Amino acid sequence: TKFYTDAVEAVKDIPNGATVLVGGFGLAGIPENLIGALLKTGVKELTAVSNNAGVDNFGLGLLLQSKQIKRMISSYVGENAEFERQYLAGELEVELTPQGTLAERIRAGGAGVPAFYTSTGYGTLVQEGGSPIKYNKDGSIAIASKPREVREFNGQHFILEEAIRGDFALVKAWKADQAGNVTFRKSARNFNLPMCKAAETTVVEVEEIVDIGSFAPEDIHIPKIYVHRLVKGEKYEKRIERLSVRKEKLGDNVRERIIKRAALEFEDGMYANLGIGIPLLASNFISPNMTVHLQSENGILGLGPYPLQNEVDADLINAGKETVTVLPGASYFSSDESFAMIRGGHVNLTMLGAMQVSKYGDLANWMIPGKLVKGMGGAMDLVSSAKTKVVVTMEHSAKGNAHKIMEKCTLPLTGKQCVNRIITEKAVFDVDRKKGLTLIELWEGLTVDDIKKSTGCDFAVSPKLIPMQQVT
């Protein structure tokens, strides 16, 4: 490990056109001093591999404003006007990559694995190709993603994904000892850890340089062997994107009914990953005596309530980028380990919203051609495992009684045959492996006929059809 005092000196040799991995999830764990260093060198045409694109004036966004990025490889790019303008203007190439796939590919890149198979993205634009990478001035697509190879294993379909290696990796860590060993604080770890292993030259900026012995040899997140260049951050703003505090939620009729039904999916000792909104709100009605373990794909197991003014930490945020807290017994881990857990099917329940759900469990909730193209985030991984139960919480129909439940989705798919249950303010549907969409619950006062005209496809009706339940 070579130590530097000046950050510019640590990245003055990054070549124009270089692939650079940039740690960070939202504004948590971003190497701001190294980013500031690139602003100064004026290096350009970079291919930035980063989960997100920061915001307009922080993180990657700063390199977007200075036009130093030619191509981005990320999972979610919302909340960044500069990114949106460049991407839609044809000034920025972007490869929307499932967060978990992105993490494992970086991981493979550092582990000498040129390629591996995954089910994430199977049955979507990731596998089929066609995802917009570059737009023309008029709005048409100039560059689309190419299809992936599909291979069968044990009766299931997987696609071939290639490792990601960088010439450089700009990493943000918490502490580094005088030997070069590195550790990360809370959820600020995310992609920084795997990124330290997949680049020819890894440059790490820490908030503190510590003495050798500050860490137990068993608790070193990144061994020195991976840290090529190290520099102590000169300054840290640690901006908070979404300040969420609780002073120590039902809303309207439709949302309230969905929340109260969704709350009954939770089971004692269950490991769950909940999308922001209804699912997360439903966790608020979980019995005080029931133990549910919430997982955050950004690397957290044991999520807690929103912090009080004094518990607000920029290094601790949920997948929705909100400042949160963790409960005693919680654990943190990298983005790649996080998706290994999700892809491997160790999470019992995944509950999220959706724009469309098909008769046999297809899900569509990440893109609307020509209207909404911000990436899939970790939504494709969250629904990729067969061992995980997937529940969708959503209005039964859209405005004008526009169907959201249909035979097949008209919107780009997040996942194929992955939804196990659907909960709307009007009904609850199970998607059994043989019959498909099956009405098991119906809101009081409504008839099967009311459901038929609100639903886009025909469905089986359970002989045990009960009035829709509501958390007591």
Residue 118 pairs in a beta bridge with 159
Which of 99, 101, 118, 123 has the alpha carbon at shortest distance from 364? 123
Question: Do 48 and 72 touch, CB atoms closer than 8 A?
Answer: yes
Greatest Cα pair distance in the chain: 72
Choose which of 8, 143, 220, 240 interacts with its own copies (CB under 8 A): 220
Output 213 or 251, the one with its CB closest to its own copies.
Answer: 213
Choose which of 42, 139, 288, 328 interacts with its own copies (CB under 8 A): 328
Which one of 28-36, 135-143, 332-340, 394-402 is the stretch in contact with its own copies (CB under 8 A)? Answer: 332-340
Residue type, 314: A
Output 149 or 458, the one with its CB closest to its own copies.
Answer: 149
Choose which of 341, 380, 418, 422 interacts with its own copies (CB under 8 A): 341
Interface residues for its own copies in 164-183 (CB under 8 A)? 177-179, 181, 183
| Dist CA 263 CA 156 (whole Å) | 31
Choose which of 71, 148, 172, 189 interacts with its own copies (CB under 8 A): 189
Interaction between residue 438 and its own copies (CB under 8 A): no
Choose which of 52, 75, 190, 295 interacts with its own copies (CB under 8 A): 295
How does DSSP assign 204-260, residue by residue?
A: EEEEEEE-TTSS-GGG-SB-GGG-SEEEE-S------SB---------SHHHHHHHH
Which one of 80-88, 209-217, 447-455, 461-469 is the stretch in contact with its own copies (CB under 8 A)? Answer: 209-217
| Dist CA 84 CA 58 (whole Å) | 15
User: Is 297 known to be catalytic?
Assistant: yes
Which one of 140-148, 337-345, 372-380, 410-418 is the stretch in contact with its own copies (CB under 8 A)? Answer: 337-345
How far is residue 363 from each of residues 105, 275, 432, 437, measured CA to CA in Å? Answer: 24, 14, 15, 13
104: part of which helix (H) or strand (E)?
helix 99-110
| Dist CA 377 CA 420 (whole Å) | 21
Instruction: Give the distance from CA 40 to its chain's centroid.
Output: 31
Q: Which of 95, 297, 425, 441 is catalytic?
A: 297
The values of phi and psi at residue 462, to 5°, are: -70, 140
Output 209 or 465, the one with its CB closest to its own copies.
Answer: 209
Instruction: Give the distance from CA 441 to its chain's centroid.
Output: 31
Calculate helix-pair angle for 99-110, 335-343, nearest 10 degrees: 120
Find the shortest distance in angstroms from Cβ 83 to its own copies. Answer: 30
Output 337 or 450, the one with its CB closest to its own copies.
Answer: 337
Interaction between residue 57 and its own copies (CB under 8 A): no
Choose which of 42, 217, 288, 370 interacts with its own copies (CB under 8 A): 217
Which one of 31-39, 57-65, 72-80, 333-341 is the stretch in contact with its own copies (CB under 8 A)? Answer: 333-341
Interaction between residue 113 and its own copies (CB under 8 A): yes
Which two tokens mark 1? Answer: 């490990």
DSSP summary character for residue 339 = H
SS3 466: strand
Find the shortest distance in angstroms from Cβ 18 to its own copies. Answer: 17
Question: Do 424 and 434 touch, CB atoms closer than 8 A?
Answer: no
Interaction between residue 293 and its own copies (CB under 8 A): yes
| Dist CA 51 CA 99 (whole Å) | 7
Choose which of 301, 324, 355, 413 interacts with its own copies (CB under 8 A): 301
Which of 165, 127, 133, 151 has the alpha carbon at shortest distance from 380? 127
# residues near its own copies by CB under 8 A:
66
SS3 335: helix
Interaction between residue 273 and its own copies (CB under 8 A): no
Find the shortest distance in angstroms from Cβ 44 to its own copies. Answer: 25
Interaction between residue 347 and its own copies (CB under 8 A): yes
Which one of 24-32, 86-94, 257-265, 329-337 is the stretch in contact with its own copies (CB under 8 A)? Answer: 329-337
Which one of 47-55, 71-79, 114-122, 396-404 is the stretch in contact with its own copies (CB under 8 A)? Answer: 114-122
| Dist CA 255 CA 277 (whole Å) | 10
How does DSSP assign 421-445, residue by residue?
A: EEE-SSEEEEEETTTEEEEEEE-TT
| Dist CA 301 CA 179 (whole Å) | 30
Interaction between residue 402 and its own copies (CB under 8 A): no
Output 131 or 183, the one with its CB closest to its own copies.
Answer: 183
Interaction between residue 115 and its own copies (CB under 8 A): yes
Interaction between residue 344 and its own copies (CB under 8 A): yes
- Where along the sequence are the contacts to its own copies (CB under 8 A)? 104, 107-119, 151, 153-154, 156, 158, 162, 177-179, 181, 183-186, 189, 197-198, 212-213, 216-221, 223-226, 271, 293, 295, 301-302, 326, 328-333, 339-347, 384-385
Write out the catalytic residue numbers: 297
